Design a protein around this nucleic acid. Structure first.
Lengths: 308, 107, 303, 93, 98, 153, 216, 82, 93, 107, 82, 98
DNA sequence: ATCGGATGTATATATCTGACACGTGCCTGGAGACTAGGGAGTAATCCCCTTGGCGGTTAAAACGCGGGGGACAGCGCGTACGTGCGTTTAAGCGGTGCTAGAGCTGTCTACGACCAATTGAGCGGCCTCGGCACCGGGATTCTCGA
DNA sequence: TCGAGAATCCCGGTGCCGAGGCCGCTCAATTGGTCGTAGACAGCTCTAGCACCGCTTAAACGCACGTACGCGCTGTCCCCCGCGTTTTAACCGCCAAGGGGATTACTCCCTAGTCTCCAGGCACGTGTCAGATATATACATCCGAT
């Protein structure tokens, strides 16, 4: 539905705050900031020699946090492209995430170690707690306002901490239905409202409302707002995301390189988009204020708009 | 010595005393629950009501005052629950409910 | 009521002036004419900044960029031309209109251009590549005026066939068609500052403010004279809320916005006051008349 | 030789449901045979269950359970209600 | 010119009226003679109720129309309007009659 | 297939089945972009569904505005007026030998005028139907057919 | 097909204004603001015919108007605002046409069951006329000058007027003419005519057409 | 009085009448006798079992209630005969 | 809990027919369930026929008749002969 | 007075005492005949003999001493009259007796 | 602990294994879920009836003898469980 | 060069060995979970005997292979080696399961 | 796709009636009242099966992947089957007449019922050990390309 | 079609626990009176069955014949079989908690059993209309020409 030839080795992309620019990582380890309106590249940053697998914009949009595969995280000014700060860790980083209401702070989910929240002003770090002490794979995310931290382990356990004190403000373990746990693949939130989603190893996306988890307290049984899956193909989901408003949810079937689109309230499947059967789907994102969807597959980006 | 039958005591029609004597002579249990005849006869009353009601439905559907066994067959074949109840049961002068298969119609 | 008095008289276009526009910062005044020349002037002293040429035929419209850095010039050479206002460089020349281009306007984000031409089709243009992205058989007569809404989601179009059509930008969808029980040749059209209303001039000495959400004319303004030429109309907002326009009687009419009553009549022009421009910040109004005058007059009031 | 039946009772309930609608003797004996069959059904089932409970007594709970076994869904539900009604009406004697 | 209805049509109406009718479709005396012939096989000179033999013939014909019915159905699954003996045999097979 | 299901399929495939190009018949017209089978739904003449009594008031209105009337009689009571609001079906020329034909269908109670294909239409073909315009006193026709009446009327 | 959602020839719902309410208990018509117009299902093209209007409610601020109107009749106008409509005002019997009121008429009553006779021939249409009756009693000729074009019986509502049209077989004071036709008769006549219209248009599917000696 | 061959006493018109009642359009010949056989086989059981009842009934005439209890035991119970 | 079965008599009659053979306890349980099935079958049929005969006494004539009703052909014949011989033996003393 | 089992006087293997016990406890009649349990137990012993013999046949055919339910199922589906008696019966660890259809064969 | 969707826990390989046991060569996809449904429907009865027994048994655990008497009442009796 | 047996052949041998084998062909735990899911519909939190559920699964699979068997037979009467859902439906129909 | 003609079918009518609703006198099962036992109900105890979880494995399931194999659609023909009309034929009414055998009553008697006293056949429980299940390996035979 | 290869059959050897055998330890089987009674049996009816025979006729059998579905064959598509790989969770083994299942011991509410009396049910007459039947009629629908 529209691709871009000017960028190669597309690996990960991230919309700015207003959906005007798109910073995509490349295998060479370069940032290509491409613009939607002019439909051209706005900037090229020599980030790493190592490909970039995690990219996030700042609220003002003037800062981007990037994570190399060399366990090298670096902050870059979007106007200049300079490495504002640079850090390195063990257990290679799985994800970075600016704090939505304090760009000085940034959470980092490493591979084998617990997620740690650092600041840019002071090169300090706060190691977030781990429930089972043996997960070794915990994804973590700020909420819409950056007031709480949602951490999900490979054993389906979900901890809601407060971003300042790291104190356990809520907890519950998700189920595979019968009695079993499932690897929490990812936690996503809505930029509007309080509904959030969880991608899990059961190939079933679970949509909740964080207020219900907060009122559920620690070690409770909160039910999902919605349960979403491909009952037909039972396809895993490499990457999913809400709509900009938060009433539409998309999942990327990397198994067959397709895109499923459900609603939030009803949860019925809006539609399906089919990509090149030979392309391996890698990355998925939604335009924050447009019915536009960016896809990264086999190093190539595609655009999916929706007109009246 | 005021008399009142258990059917009137249940305000129903089926003879509780008669059915009680019947089950007694039926050699199913040594002692009996005194209310079991009442209960069972009430169940019979209910089911009989439904089946005769559907029968009469077909009957006046055919302008028939006195119900014919064909009405009975049609009734027992229409209702899913009663048909399931009496699937392997046969009915005298029953016949077959109207049923033509799709491909039977010429095109 | 305003008390606009003449402060500066501007002239120099060898031919009939077709448009004068205040820069959004209020720093310059761009004046287009059929002489294939544009003239930038000082907006507060009447100081002639420069002349920008390059168009091959008469110029029917010119429009500023939002950052006061670019100017689109729609000329009778069937071409648009995007210029850097600081250097006067022809950054782009837009080709593709099959006939005389009469109007041109930037999007609220200044990255896009709408253009109406005699070809009776409205073309939608890129800025950074100058590429025509859309083309619409909008009207059954040459387009008179095109303009953006407050955000760039809607494009209003007027033409000599008397139709005022609102079109979707993302899709070109003809959203609305405003009709006033007759076919009055609409020579000008534009959105309200709040994007809620639309001011359209018809060639019968009549101006009409319509509600967009209602699709009906809210207010009417008469007393002026306009029946043949593209006489511009502006919203006076820096002081009181007024409606300023030219007229074929050499007058500069100013009505009250709400009461629709004439609040001032600026006289001093000798020809038809062909183009009008209201200052974005100050109570300054530039009134340019036709070839029998060839003069642009700055008017400043106190309210 | 006296031969018992329920034509009186089936006619009674007929009138109670349809005072207008008549009845044929053929269908009458059909009704009689049918109710005999279903009564033997419930009798055998309840006796079997009680034998499983090894309880020499047969009570109403057995009847409810076994008719629930017998009837397709909602019928039983409806059924048991009136049955309960009955015993209530009889326990309230 | 003589008229002849298209095939099945007359038989179709026969089907319709037979689903309409309810009485027997077998002559009484032949059926009775057959029953008594079968009886003498197990024991000779046995008497019967007319009600009894009426029940025999009714119940038989019921089983028979049921067999014809589901064999018709099977032949539908056989995509034919003509019946085949194998249909009846396999129907009994599914009916556990083998 | 159900007329509603067929109509949904037609409204789904219409945007990619047909196009409008320069026409040797006259000006611009509807051409086939994908081989269309006989009797299948080619295109709806979609537009403003109005009652018949309001036709003239509209027509004169357009007569006052110099805008051509795009109206097709649904029946004696309704008309699809596409003058101001319509679809690509406003560019279907006429031929005395049409490979298409107009029919009114009833979907959920509302009438739709659908041009179907009189025959198996192949890609590139210009789409034309019988307007069945009554005989006036004269519009010359350039449909190119050997049976051409020389006049729609 | 032009199948009409009607058991009998009634006031066609296809030709009412969005501000026009109907009650099929009596098929009465009512409105809320100003005037509006509704018409019947049928429409006359020739011959003489006759119907009635029964009034069930006429408060002082309630004035219905009843008459005939050709197509081109704007159903929001009060049945006589144009030259193609001729009606009567139900306050005093007053013939209204071209929005002009004429007192060449009798008086109207609140509970009037008014009969409406009208004859069009097979630049006034020759020998065409309109006659008005109050409960069969001749209220007199309304309009002799009748323009060409088909006409249909119509009802205009003012604020909350309750009136209804009615055919012949259930009449109260019917004329005994053997030539005039009730509403239902012309109704099924026009219905069958439009059936044949569909027939002939779908024929025009097959090459050729042919019709008998023209006169009928 | 020794009986025989009443099986063919079943007329093919009777068989096709029953078939039409069963809603059958086209039939082959090979069925009828086959049909008959089945018929026989079917009744082959019940009468015997029936007279088996009559066996224990120690009676010379055979009654309906016999076949009633047979069809019951044959899981093909019938109504209308006591 | 004292539970009763017949597998011992199964082993007995097995040795009576096949001395050099073993059995799966599973198969023994299956056979015993089969024993129970045939027993309940014959008992119910006998009680039912006696009810038809209005008899409250189930005797060997009932036994034989019900077996004949149940078993086919030579199965029934041999079973009848065997039961007859056995009751003759028991009645002989 | 020495107590010998009545089955001994019957010369049988199944406990006729337990038989008659189940009989009286079975609610079949008011009083069981004397030789009726004897007769029915004899029938039971005979049929058990038949089935066990068939099972031993099958097992030895399969070169098996311990007889698994599969042998018994096979023998069941091998005896036509026994099958008729038990075709309505299901068999744990029975499987299906090898049955191959004609058109199923290759060529 | 609320359960769900174990019906699809029935693997298509399991279904085709059962089919091969039934002596089937070629199979279509449309069967399996259909199959499953039937399966469900089938068990749909027995468990209920079974627990119905347990209903009258006044117990919380469900026993084999329940389904024994069910299949018996369902005319599909089974051996080897008492 | 790679070898592949002709179609059915491998499945044919599978049939042969399955008629050879006698054990279950369903995984225990999935069946058990299904049973408990069905149970909670009528009443929640009910326990079971492993023997009980083994009986359930065995009896089920027996009914299932019987259905597969006679549907195979019907498909023979359908002259196809592929199975059709209608075969199963009509088989149940003859099985009185409709 | 229609119209015309043939034919078959739903309707009103009339009356005949014989099932059928209705009422009786007479019978006995049902109600009413009273006594006993003891099945059933409750409760405290034990056990112990179940339900729950945890970790490692892989056989099994998921999924993909050609691709020949047959489902299926179509197409010719022909034989077998509806049909309408012939023909002849037992089927049914019905009514007669005899009695063989159901079907009833009245004994009287053998026969379990039942209880009590007695106990050894049988059953839970405990060794035990050998066909049997598994495994690995070698030899055999089907099958798919010549 | 004669080999290659592959799945299988069979053989010897290993180790095991269920099949089985035996042992305490009853309660349920036997024995023997004793008693009221189920029915065995005799001995009557009467009636329903069984057969007889005649009369009418709707029904059945066969014919001829059109014809049209059954069947047989061809080519296509697609699709499910077979194999390869990758993932997983069933299984399996072990542990543990408790919650229900089963048990026993009391305790007594309810039912069986008895006796009394009669009133609802049942056989039996009795008018009587729902509907069966026949007829003419009006409507629906097929089949062939157009």
């Amino acid at each position: 539905d529209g691709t871009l030839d000017c960028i190669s080795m597309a690996l990960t992309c991230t919309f700015n705050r207003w959906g005007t620019l798109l910073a995509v990582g490349c295998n060479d380890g370069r940032i290509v900031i491409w613009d939607f309106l002019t439909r051209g590249i706005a900037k090229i940053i020599s980030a790493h020699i190592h490909p970039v697998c995690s990219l996030c914009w700042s609220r003002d949009g003037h800062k981007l946090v990037s994570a190399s595969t060399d366990n090298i995280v670096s902050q870059w000014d979007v106007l200049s492209g300079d490495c504002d700060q640079r850090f390195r860790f063990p257990s290679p980083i799985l994800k970075v995430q600016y704090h939505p209401r304090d760009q000085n702070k940034v959470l980092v989910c490493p591979m084998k170690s617990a997620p740690v929240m650092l600041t840019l002003s002071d090169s300090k770090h706060v190691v977030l707690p781990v429930d089972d002490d043996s997960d070794l794979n915990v994804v973590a995310s700020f909420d819409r306002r950056g007031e709480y931290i949602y951490t999900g382990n490979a054993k389906g356990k979900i901890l809601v901490l407060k971003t300042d004190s790291q104190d356990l403000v809520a907890s519950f373990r998700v189920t595979t239905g019968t009695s079993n746990t499932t690897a929490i693949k990812s936690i996503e939130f809505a930029r509007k409202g309080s509904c959030f989603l969880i991608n899990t190893a059961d190939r079933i996306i679970r949509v909740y409302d964080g207020r219900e988890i907060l009122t559920c307290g620690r070690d409770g049984e909160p039910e999902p707002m919605q349960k979403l899956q491909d009952l037909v193909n039972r396809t895993p989901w490499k990457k999913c995301c809400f709509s900009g408003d938060g009433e539409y949810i998309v999942a990327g079937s990397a198994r067959q390189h397709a895109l499923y689109i459900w609603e939030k309230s009803i949860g019925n499947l809006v539609k399906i988009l089919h990509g090149t059967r030979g392309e391996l789907l890698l990355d998925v994102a939604w335009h924050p204020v447009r019915p536009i969807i960016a896809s990264i597959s086999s190093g190539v980006v595609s655009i999916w708009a929706q007109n009246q | 010595a005021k008399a009142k039958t258990r059917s009137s005591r249940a305000g129903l029609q089926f003879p509780v005393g008669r059915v009680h004597r019947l089950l007694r002579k039926g050699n199913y249990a040594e002692r009996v629950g005194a209310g079991a005849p009442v209960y069972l006869a009430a169940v019979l009353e209910y089911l009989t009501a439904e089946i005769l009601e559907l029968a009469g439905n077909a009957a006046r559907d055919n302008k028939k005052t006195r119900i014919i066994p064909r009405h009975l067959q049609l009734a027992v074949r229409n209702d899913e629950e009663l048909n399931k109840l009496l699937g392997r049961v046969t009915i005298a002068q029953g016949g077959v409910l109207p049923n033509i298969q799709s491909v039977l119609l010429p095109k | 009521k305003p008390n606009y008095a003449l402060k500066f008289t501007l002239a120099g276009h060898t031919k009939a002036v077709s448009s004068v526009k205040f820069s959004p910062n209020g720093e310059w005044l761009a004046s287009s004419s059929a002489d294939k020349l544009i003239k930038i002037w000082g907006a507060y002293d009447g100081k002639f900044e420069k002349t920008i040429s390059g168009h091959k035929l008469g110029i029917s419209d010119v429009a500023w960029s939002s950052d006061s850095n670019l100017l689109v010039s729609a000329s009778d050479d069937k071409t648009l031309k995007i210029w850097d206002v600081s250097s006067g460089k022809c950054l782009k020349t837009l080709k593709g209109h099959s006939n005389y281009v009469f109007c041109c306007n930037f999007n609220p984000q200044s990255n896009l251009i709408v253009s109406g031409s005699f070809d009776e089709s409205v073309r939608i243009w890129d800025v950074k590549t100058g590429k025509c992205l859309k083309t619409l058989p909008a009207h059954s007569d040459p387009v008179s005026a095109v303009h953006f809404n407050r955000d760039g989601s809607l494009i209003v179009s007027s033409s000599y066939d008397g139709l005022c059509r609102i079109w979707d930008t993302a899709s070109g969808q003809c959203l609305k068609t405003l009709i006033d029980d007759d076919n009055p040749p609409v020579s000008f059209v534009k959105f309200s500052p709040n994007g809620k209303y639309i001011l359209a001039a018809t060639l019968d000495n009549t101006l009409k403010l319509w509600d967009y959400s209602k699709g009906k004319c809210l207010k009417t303004y008469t007393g002026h004279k306009n029946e043949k030429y593209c006489i511009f109309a502006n919203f006076s907002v820096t002081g009181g809320k007024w409606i300023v326009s030219g007229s074929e009687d050499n007058l500069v009419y100013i009505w009250n916005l709400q009461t629709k009553e004439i609040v001032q009549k600026l006289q001093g022009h000798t020809d038809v006051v062909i183009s009008t421009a209201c200052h974005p910040t100050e109570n300054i109004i530039a009134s340019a008349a036709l070839e029998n005058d060839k003069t642009i007059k700055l008017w400043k009031s106190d309210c | 030789t006296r031969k018992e039946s329920y034509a009186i009772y089936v006619y009674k309930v007929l009138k109670q449901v349809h005072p207008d609608t008549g009845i044929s003797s053929k269908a009458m004996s059909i009704m009689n045979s049918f109710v005999n069959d279903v009564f033997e059904r419930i009798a055998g089932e309840a006796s079997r269950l009680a034998h499983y409970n090894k309880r020499s007594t047969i009570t109403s709970r057995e009847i409810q359970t076994a008719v629930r076994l017998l009837l397709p869904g909602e019928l039983a539900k409806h059924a048991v209600s009136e049955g309960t009604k009955a015993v209530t009406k009889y326990t309230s004697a | 010119k003589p008229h002849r209805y298209r095939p099945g049509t007359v038989a179709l109406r026969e089907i319709r009226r037979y689903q309409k009718s309810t009485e027997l479709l077998i002559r009484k005396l032949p059926f009775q003679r057959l029953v008594r012939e079968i009886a003498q096989d197990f024991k000779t000179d046995l008497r019967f109720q007319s009600s009894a033999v009426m029940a025999l013939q009714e119940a038989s014909e019921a089983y028979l129309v049921a067999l014809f019915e589901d064999t018709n159905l099977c032949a539908i699954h056989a995509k034919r309007v003509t019946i085949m003996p194998k249909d009846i045999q396999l129907a009994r097979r599914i009916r556990g009659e083998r | 297939l159900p007329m509603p299901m067929r109509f949904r399929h037609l409204k789904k495939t219409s945007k990619e089945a047909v196009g409008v190009y320069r026409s040797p018949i006259h000006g611009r017209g509807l051409f086939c972009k994908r081989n269309i089978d006989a009797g299948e739904m080619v295109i709806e003449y979609a537009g403003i569904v109005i009652r018949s009594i309001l036709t003239d008031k509209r027509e004169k209105y357009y007569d006052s505005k110099g805008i051509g009337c795009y109206m097709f009689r649904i029946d004696d009571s309704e008309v699809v007026d596409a003058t101001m609001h319509g679809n690509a079906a406003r560019f279907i020329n006429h031929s005395c030998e049409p490979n298409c034909y107009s029919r009114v269908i009833n979907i959920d109670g509302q009438k739709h005028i659908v041009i179907f294909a009189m025959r198996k239409i192949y890609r590139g073909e210009e789409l034309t139907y019988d307007y069945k315009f009554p005989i006036e006193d004269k519009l010359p026709c350039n449909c190119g057919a050997k049976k051409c009446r020389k006049f729609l009327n | 097909y032009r199948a009409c959602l009607y058991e009998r020839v009634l006031l066609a719902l296809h030709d009412r204004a969005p501000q026009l309410k109907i009650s099929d208990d009596r098929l009465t018509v009512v409105g809320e603001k100003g005037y509006s117009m509704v018409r019947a299902s049928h429409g006359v093209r020739k011959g003489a015919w006759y119907f009635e209007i029964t009034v069930d409610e006429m408060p002082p601020d309630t004035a219905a108007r009843l008459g005939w109107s050709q197509p081109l009749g704007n159903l929001q106008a009060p049945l006589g605002y144009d030259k193609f409509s001729y009606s009567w005002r139900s306050k005093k019997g007053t013939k209204f046409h071209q929005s002009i009121g004429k007192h060449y008429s009798s008086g109207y009553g609140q509970g009037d069951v008014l009969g409406f006779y009208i004859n069009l021939p097979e630049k006034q249409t020759p020998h065409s006329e309109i006659i008005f009756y109050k409960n069969g009693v001749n209220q007199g000729v309304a309009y002799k000058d009748i323009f060409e074009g088909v006409y249909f019986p119509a009802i205009s509502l003012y604020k909350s007027c309750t009136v209804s049209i009615n055919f012949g077989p259930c009449f109260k004071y019917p004329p005994k003419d053997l030539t005039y036709r009730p509403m239902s008769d012309m109704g099924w006549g026009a219905v069958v005519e439009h059936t044949l219209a569909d027939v002939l248009y779908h024929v025009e599917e097959v090459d050729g057409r042919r019709s008998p000696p023209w006169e009928p | 009085k020794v009986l025989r061959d009443n099986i063919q006493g079943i007329t093919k018109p009777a068989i096709r009448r029953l078939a039409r009642r069963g809603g059958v359009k086209r039939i082959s010949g090979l069925i009828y006798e086959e049909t008959r056989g089945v018929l026989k086989v079917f009744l082959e059981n019940v009468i015997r079992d029936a007279v088996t009842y009559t066996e224990h009934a120690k009676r010379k005439t055979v009654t309906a209630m016999d076949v009633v209890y047979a069809l019951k035991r044959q899981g093909r119970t019938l109504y209308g005969f006591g």
